[PDB]
Design a protein around this ligand. Structure first.
Ligand SMILES: O=C(O)C(=O)Nc1cc2ccccc2cc1C(=O)O
Length: 297
């Protein structure tokens, strides 16, 4: 069991070692495109880039480049776009990717300001009188409404392709108490947030892939997706013990670098999947309990 493993690792405090092993073993593929000097100002961090083999191309003839990757989890049969928090000049490219990629959901795991510095553009309307229009990719976005919880806010956004005037509904899940390079307050809060996403349809295969982002698109986002896919996988077999959390991590590793940034994120991910196993193995009432402990309201 993964829980035996947890306590093996814990009892012999070797999270850091494990996680270095992971860093050890993770894939390295070319990012030639990211590093074209034309794309400099499309990348928020020198050292966080999309592999070429799995980057999202924009369907624009001018420059198809965005710092985003398609994480494609074939056995789980679940796929995600991870991306950095939008720069002031790429809010338009972000929404072009949501449009072409036909996503229903966007998961933000960061604040615009973290630790004194600006992590991310304010890329969505904070208020419904004040749409945003993105001139360069020709898209309208309007706040249609929000549901503010203590530790997260869900928003209904309308997104409009100004060229056809066709319209889509986007849900935006903003977790607001997940520290940069940190873990959530508890497994209950994270699982309550994850399960809000699931419930919303946005992780379901009649939509394009959910868009997940932090500021770099790697630490917090990796953690979200790792826990989600492990729960998916165990759910399909009802077999907790055929789930190798570290193998799943390195599988996601093939499609975008540096996923899960810290050993406490690794440990947190185990905690989240171990807890969530409760619900996946037929204790639906755990999900209530989550909502309760999480103090959502
Ligand atoms: O939000 C996150 O967890 C995340 O991935 N952050 C980061 C990951 C980084 C990884 C490598 C280099 C710079 C990074 C910078 C940030 C950052 O936010 O400052």
């Amino acid at each position: 069991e993964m829980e035996k493993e947890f306590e093996q690792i814990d009892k012999s405090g070797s999270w850091a070692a494990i996680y270095q092993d992971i860093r050890h073993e993770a894939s390295d593929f070319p990012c030639r495109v990211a590093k074209l000097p034309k794309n400099k100002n499309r990348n928020r961090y020198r050292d966080v880039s999309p592999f070429d083999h799995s980057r999202i191309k924009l369907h624009q003839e001018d420059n198809d480049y965005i710092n985003a990757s398609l994480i494609k989890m074939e056995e789980a049969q679940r796929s995600y776009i991870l991306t950095q928090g939008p720069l002031p000049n790429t809010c338009g490219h972000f929404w072009e990717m949501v449009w072409e990629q036909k996503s229903r959901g966007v998961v933000m795991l960061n604040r615009v300001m973290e630790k004194g510095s600006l992590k991310c553009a304010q890329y969505w309307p904070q208020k419904e009188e004040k749409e945003m229009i993105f001139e360069d990719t020709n898209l309208k976005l309007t706040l249609i409404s929000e549901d503010i919880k203590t530790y997260y806010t869900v928003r209904q956004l309308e997104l409009e392709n100004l060229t056809t005037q066709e319209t889509r509904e986007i849900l935006h899940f903003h977790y607001t108490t997940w520290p940069d390079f940190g873990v959530p307050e508890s497994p209950a809060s994270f699982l309550n947030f994850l399960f809000k996403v699931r419930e919303s349809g946005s992780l379901s295969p009649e939509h394009g892939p959910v868009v997940v982002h932090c500021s770099a698109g790697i630490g917090r986002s990796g953690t979200f997706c790792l826990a989600d896919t492990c729960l998916l996988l165990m759910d399909k077999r009802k077999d907790p013990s055929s789930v190798d959390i570290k193998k799943v991590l390195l599988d996601m590793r093939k499609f975008r670098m540096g996923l899960i940034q810290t050993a406490d994120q690794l440990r947190f991910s185990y905690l989240a999947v171990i807890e969530g196993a409760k619900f996946i193995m037929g204790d639906s009432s755990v999900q209530d309990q989550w909502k309760e402990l999480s103090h959502e309201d």
